Design a protein around this ligand. Structure first.
Ligand SMILES: CCC[C@H](O)[C@@H](C)C(=O)NC/C=C\C[C@@H](C)[C@@H](O)[C@H](C)[C@@H]1C/C=C\C[C@H](C)[C@H](O)Cc2cc(OC)cc(O)c2C(=O)O1
Ligand SMILES: Nc1ncnc2c1ncn2[C@@H]1O[C@H](COP(=O)(O)OP(=O)(O)OP(=O)(O)O)[C@@H](O)[C@H]1O
Ligand SMILES: Nc1ncnc2c1ncn2[C@@H]1O[C@H](COP(=O)(O)OP(=O)(O)OP(=O)(O)O)[C@@H](O)[C@H]1O
Lengths: 469, 100, 242, 121, 312, 312, 121
């Protein structure tokens, strides 16, 4: 085999000399047998004099010059298919759940080309999420990129678990969740939550595969964990023909890790410190996430904004790729409306009559107008009092609060602690229900009959049971 | 402008906008009192109308002032972000040119 | 306690520049984030399988000019589970230990808070948030609404209760009765200067007269409904004497 | 139609910084103006001796936060013969195509307007 | 547009030759200038011509855009010294010379100054800009446009150029967005010749009172922005109303830009200007609406427009 | 001027040897200090002297300015350790030790750090600044002037130096331009010794109430600027007035300042200071005008000056 | 009289960059202080043993927008035994020579003022 000695070790950067004069290609993976486990190096440059420069996927403490490296003959390659479901994988595709080997038939290289222009899908399509406020007011793009916004405590993890559950139930497609520079505490809490919710099931069938890269990992690993997760999702698309979900726990951490890798290589920093390759790095990650003839990978990505500066180059570069945005915000949860999606700040490029159809677009537009008018008056109606307005405006306020409560939904993942049985609401049923509410057909029913309920037939049944009460 | 100058200016305009919104609320409570006096007096009727008018004009002016301050806070937030970015990149270019 | 991680980052910058490693955003090396994350991720709570031990970390950061957006502050803020922000403005208004409660946040420790204290602090955080919104009315306290007047009264008494002398930490048995009295509003009638003398007097009243109450708070760690009634009676009796 | 010259400028910044060219304003290279002007000077109307042919260009630019004062916007404004400015406030008020009539101007095309439109406008 | 108005007003009234150098500006603008020169008659292809044209436009490599200004200046210097003529030298966008110096310097591999400019920026500018002087052999007037990147007047190239100029006119984007053309900032624009020994005491007085009025208005403008004009004193309200009238009256329809304004071009004599602004400072026209002052050619036109508005 | 006042007040009363090190200060300030110390009998050329002078002023090369502080330290350390004395060490512009290190740094071949300072800045300073400590062999009291290179206390040299000091006396340009001398900022000047265990509860309480009053007045500056003091409540009006009294009362004439102030210099005892500010906080003098508090040597001087203005 | 030390500092910044010496604060070289200080320390009054001679210096500095806090202004202020500060507001208000009496101070020349002028002033 092609094998070479270590010749320099400078933090996470290692130089390797291949006296065989058959150098590993750029992005090839090389491996060293450390006393514990193994250390993987990814090739980053060819320096000349048979010497390559490489970035380390693990800590380099204890390396010696003259240490022996094997060229693995390709990029980092990770196990794929069903065996990944319900298991936690690191950047190099080792199991870190301690449940033993993954023993898949296949490994796939994490570096691969996007689908060609002829391969691209020529028209947009809606991924029905089963979530009323999403499926109506910010429909998710099948094969698209979706940004997820908000602080802590807004319910992101329960929303993500319900997306995993709903897409597994309604579409049969699996999910992959990749945590990029995540807190190891929060990755542990996520794994525990996912076992309690049962989207991971150690004895049974698991609906999600987990990939994690930790803040304590070197920047090369944190930079590549997104590509490992993407490569598993791509395998489910390409060879199971599924509609897959790919969750990225923070895409800013991916940008930051790429910036650290670039700085360690010694490239001149750019717009505000980010690597000069910032846009091409993002483009190489993102536009592999697409629909093809066999299926789609749809990606939900958590967009941290470094100083609330939406104009910062990492947000501005990410926003170019997003097909939709979902904002979770504290205020909507303070009204007690879960999933706490902001119905007005969430937006979709696909909410256009050609993609959705005119009926959906009309219903969603009328809902948005009703909520925006209610929010605009809501201060002055509190100043003047509720009677101090036109009876038509007071009627639109009654509609607005009834619709706003109607946007709450019981999640089946929530059921383990909320107790109320979760419900998955189809897109057509959502459009019909909100059209009927906007037509005023249920103006008589009290607004609390609309809270945490699975559609207008369920609104009627809840009103009947609560009136019998 | 240096980043601290625009940060201090922005902080001051946010303070003024809160101050004027509170003065608006206080003017609205005084306007309720003035409306009570105006109706009860309906020279005393002159001062009761003039007081209710002054309190209403102050409420309106403080509403306008708060809206103007909100727009200026938006403008200064944008200029603050642009100054922050420009400072970061200029200092990093100076560090790189020193390292060369 | 890492009583300054900024001076470690500066020392590692010295090393990196003298080793002639390529500089970054403030001439710190590109892996100074890797340095602090590799240090801080070692703080953990272990499972019963691993003996259930724990290491807690408190890193300290000196923000130059209050700039929380400097590079090392940004990194450690992103690595840590929560932030306690201290401000010179608060310190000179006499709010000491000067914790900015608006910015300070704990992502995880709200699950670890002592239950007896959590029962009372749930009200406290709301009354403080309201006070911080209404505080600008304090400059113009004539013709206030009764709601904003009462918000200023509670907010001022609570703020004056949260200040504390250096090197005088209080047991939780001593903390929960004082915050209970503040949030329920037994201090609303007390002159704001007296509130500090109230603290030492009311504790002295509880310790001598109601030592069984403080003992039960300490031993159970939670306030039963019986204990809330007992604490109400003791607080009202003290205020009646006070 | 150059559907984003800002992205060409970003690609040229990447290429120049990987060449270790010294960064300038906003870390763009100094000749980023030369990059766009030698491009946009190629759009021209020729004389009848040259066969009367023409090439018209429409470059496209994204302004972060609507800042027309940024470096690349002011560079391309200084190269082109006018601009159509599309205001986000108008676009979200549903005024579409959202042409801001004050900040847009055609610096040479007024001679090329259809005379009937010139008369009625 | 300002340079082209100056060319129309001055250049055919000037007795001697002219030279125009286009440095790194549009090849379209050069062709339009050449056509306008032939149509006005400053160039005759079958006769005598008063102007020489030198161009190295923004399509040219950085070496050419760097050196072309020296060719134009060498022709101007030959007319000054050898012919003994009074020359006026126009340089459209001298910043493009400086920027071209930076571009070649980046390829030379010098360590940059400031925001990536070359070292020798100051001596480069000195060696160019010192040759433009008038001498005992002949006068050379020059008018130099200076692009300001990102409108940043702190940029090293503008800040270097300000040191060399006898008069500077600063055109502000904000003023132009108010529709005040020709967009000159009245306070940042300054001249060596604004001296009572040169302009005369009446002109110096009028200019000083205008400047003090506009500086007072600028000082108020953020109080006015938050609170409106009603919070001002009566003296402030009068000073602000007159400052608004004055700054609105500094607008003027240029003949070259009537395509953009519809109003035909106006020239206003210096004496008529000083009398008009002194009469405005006297408050004599404080009753006239501000719109009558906007975009007109002196105070008689302000009165005519005010009469037209009042009849309408 | 502040160091020279401290020398006048302490260095003659100290009853132990002293060392003064000029590090990149003016050679004239050294000659003036030497004349003063020679005429005030601290130096007796025909007798015994109590101060040693070490100078490496700003005419000296950076290598000298980077090492003269170590000479001063070495003499002071010999008095502390070998003689066993209590020693008083003054250093004028210790910043110049750090700056000279930057001047050599690039020629040594080091990559410059954040704003061109040497990488070793913190450890070079820490190696110097840790020798100045008091020990069990003897005490050193040390007073160090620190220059601030654009009045920014966030510059790495000031910001690093703050970590090394028991007491920090931030002087500020704004306060000095208000004519408040000695221009000490009452906030962001701080000491380790301001403990009720050390100063006593009465002092600690007076100083705390002073700082709350001054921070309140600093908070109200925005509304006093835009909305005027007429918007304040009666308690806020009282607090602003009393804060302006306290702020002027912190001013004081020094003897050396007698040249610049014309007022004979005065020393105010610590007990008299605490009593005076306590009485002012009690509102005892709310009727006295603010200028009676400016440049006075305590509250007896305030009352006498108020009587003088009343007689005027 | 040095009618601009700031222009010397600009020339020395250029020369330092051509010597490939790295810039410091405000991109001036780190020893830009030492350049002015070793210059200005040469102005002196000698003792009678040294023949009583004198050299008096009047360095000139250009502020930007009156900003005396800028690096080169505050450097030279830290050398020059005082300053005369000339104010644009006074000058353009026609109070010439426009000396701001508050910010101008002579740290040593009060000992050298003409006694009659001190008595009357
Ligand atoms: C992205 C960069 C933006 C950049 O900042 C801007 C300068 C730029 O790049 N291009 C715009 C350049 C020219 C266009 C003008 C000819 C003209 O079309 C518009 C409408 C202007 C808009 C200004 C004020 C409106 C006001 C009612 C005025 O008073 C209207 C007005 C009336 C008038 O009376 C005959 C004459 C005038 O010139 C104007 C006037 O200036 O309006
Ligand atoms: N005095 C004026 N009267 C009318 N319109 C004017 C006037 N000055 C400028 N404009 C308008 O503003 C724009 C001026 O364009 P111009 O070519 O003069 O600008 P510039 O400063 O030379 O720009 P560039 O940086 O692109 O070379 C045109 O829209 C012109 O219509
Ligand atoms: N306490 C004071 N009373 C009166 N005037 C003072 C006082 N302190 C400073 N000044 C004024 O400030 C001038 C400068 O003082 P000083 O020489 O002490 O400043 P510095 O901080 O040492 O300056 P530099 O950086 O130039 O050395 C003095 O000449 C005097 O005009």
């Amino acid at each position: 085999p092609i094998t070479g000695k270590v010749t320099a070790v400078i933090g996470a950067i290692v130089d390797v000399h291949f006296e065989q004069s058959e150098l590993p290609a750029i992005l090839n993976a090389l491996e060293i047998k450390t006393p514990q486990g193994k250390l993987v190096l990814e090739v980053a440059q060819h320096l000349g004099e048979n010497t390559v420069r490489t970035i380390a996927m693990d800590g380099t403490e204890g390396l010696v010059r003259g240490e022996k490296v094997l060229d693995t003959g390709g990029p980092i390659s990770v196990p794929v298919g069903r065996e990944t479901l319900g298991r936690i994988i690191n950047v190099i595709g080792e199991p870190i759940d301690e449940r033993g080997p993954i023993k898949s038939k296949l490994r796939k290289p994490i570096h691969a080309d996007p689908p060609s222009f002829a391969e691209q899908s020529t028209s947009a399509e809606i991924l029905e999420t089963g979530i009323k406020v999403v499926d109506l007011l910010a429909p998710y793009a099948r094969g698209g990129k979706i940004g997820l916004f908000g602080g802590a405590g807004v319910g992101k993890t329960v929303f993500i678990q319900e997306l995993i559950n709903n897409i597994a139930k309604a579409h049969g497609g699996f999910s992959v969740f990749t945590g990029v520079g995540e807190r190891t505490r929060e990755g542990n809490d996520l794994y525990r939550e996912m076992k309690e919710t049962g989207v991971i099931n150690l004895e049974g069938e698991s609906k999600v595969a987990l990939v994690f890269g930790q803040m304590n990992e070197p920047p090369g690993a944190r930079a590549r964990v997104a590509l490992t997760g993407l490569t598993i999702a791509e395998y489910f698309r390409d060879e199971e023909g599924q509609d897959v979900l790919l969750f990225i726990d923070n895409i800013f951490r991916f940008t930051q890790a790429g910036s650290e890798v670039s700085a360690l290589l010694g490239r001149i920093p750019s717009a505000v410190g980010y690597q000069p390759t910032l846009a091409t790095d993002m483009g190489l990650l993102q536009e592999r996430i697409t629909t093809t003839k066999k299926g789609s990978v749809t990606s939900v990505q958590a967009v941290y904004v470094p100083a609330d500066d939406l104009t910062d180059p990492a947000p501005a570069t990410t926003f170019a790729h997003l097909d939709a945005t979902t904002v979770l915000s504290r205020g909507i949860s303070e009204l007690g409306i879960y999933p706490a999606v902001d119905p007005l700040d969430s937006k979709s490029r696909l909410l256009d009559a050609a993609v959705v159809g005119q009926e959906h677009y009309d219903v969603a537009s009328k809902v948005q107008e009703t909520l925006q008018t209610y929010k605009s008056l809501q201060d002055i109606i509190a100043i003047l009092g509720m009677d101090e307005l036109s009876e038509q405006d007071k009627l639109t306020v009654e509609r607005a609060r009834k619709i706003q409560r109607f946007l709450s939904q019981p999640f089946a993942v929530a059921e383990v602690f909320t107790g109320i049985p979760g419900k998955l609401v189809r897109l057509k049923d959502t459009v019909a229900s909100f059209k009927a509410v906007l037509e005023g057909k249920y103006d008589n029913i009290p607004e609390h009959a609309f809270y945490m309920v699975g559609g207008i037939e369920d609104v009627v049944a809840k009103a009947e049971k609560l009136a019998a009460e | 402008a240096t980043l601290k100058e625009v940060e201090m200016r922005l902080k001051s305009i946010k303070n003024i906008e809160k101050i004027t919104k509170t003065m608006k609320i206080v003017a609205s409570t005084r306007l309720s009192k003035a409306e009570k006096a105006k109706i009860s007096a309906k020279m005393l009727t002159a001062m009761a109308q003039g007081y209710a008018a002054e309190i209403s004009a102050r409420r309106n002016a403080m509403d306008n002032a708060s809206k103007n301050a909100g727009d200026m806070i938006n403008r200064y937030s944008i200029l603050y972000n642009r100054t922050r970015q420009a400072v970061i990149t200029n200092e990093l270019v100076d560090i790189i040119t020193g390292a060369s | 306690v890492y009583d300054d991680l900024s001076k470690q980052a500066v020392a590692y910058r010295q090393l990196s520049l003298l080793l002639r490693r390529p500089p970054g955003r403030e001439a710190y090396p590109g892996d100074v984030f890797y340095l602090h994350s590799r240090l801080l991720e070692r703080a953990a709570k272990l499972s019963e399988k691993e003996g259930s031990g724990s290491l807690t970390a408190l890193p300290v950061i000196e923000t130059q000019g209050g700039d929380v957006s400097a590079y090392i502050p940004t990194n450690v803020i992103s690595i840590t589970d929560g932030q306690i922000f201290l401000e010179a403005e608060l310190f000179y208004k006499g709010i000491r230990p000067a914790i900015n409660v608006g910015l300070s946040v704990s992502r995880v420790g709200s699950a670890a808070q002592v239950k007896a204290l959590k029962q009372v602090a749930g009200s406290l955080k709301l009354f403080l948030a309201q006070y911080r919104e209404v505080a600008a009315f304090a400059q113009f306290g004539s013709d206030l609404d009764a709601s904003t007047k009462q918000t200023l009264v509670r907010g001022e008494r609570l703020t004056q209760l949260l200040k504390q002398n250096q090197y005088s930490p209080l047991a939780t048995e001593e903390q929960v009765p004082l915050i209970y009295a503040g949030v329920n509003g037994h201090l609303d009638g007390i002159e704001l200067s007296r509130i500090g003398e109230f603290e030492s007097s009311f504790l002295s009243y509880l310790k001598s007269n109601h030592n069984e109450l403080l003992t039960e708070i300490r031993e159970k760690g939670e306030l039963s409904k019986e204990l809330l009634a007992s604490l109400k009676s003791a607080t009202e009796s003290f205020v009646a004497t006070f």
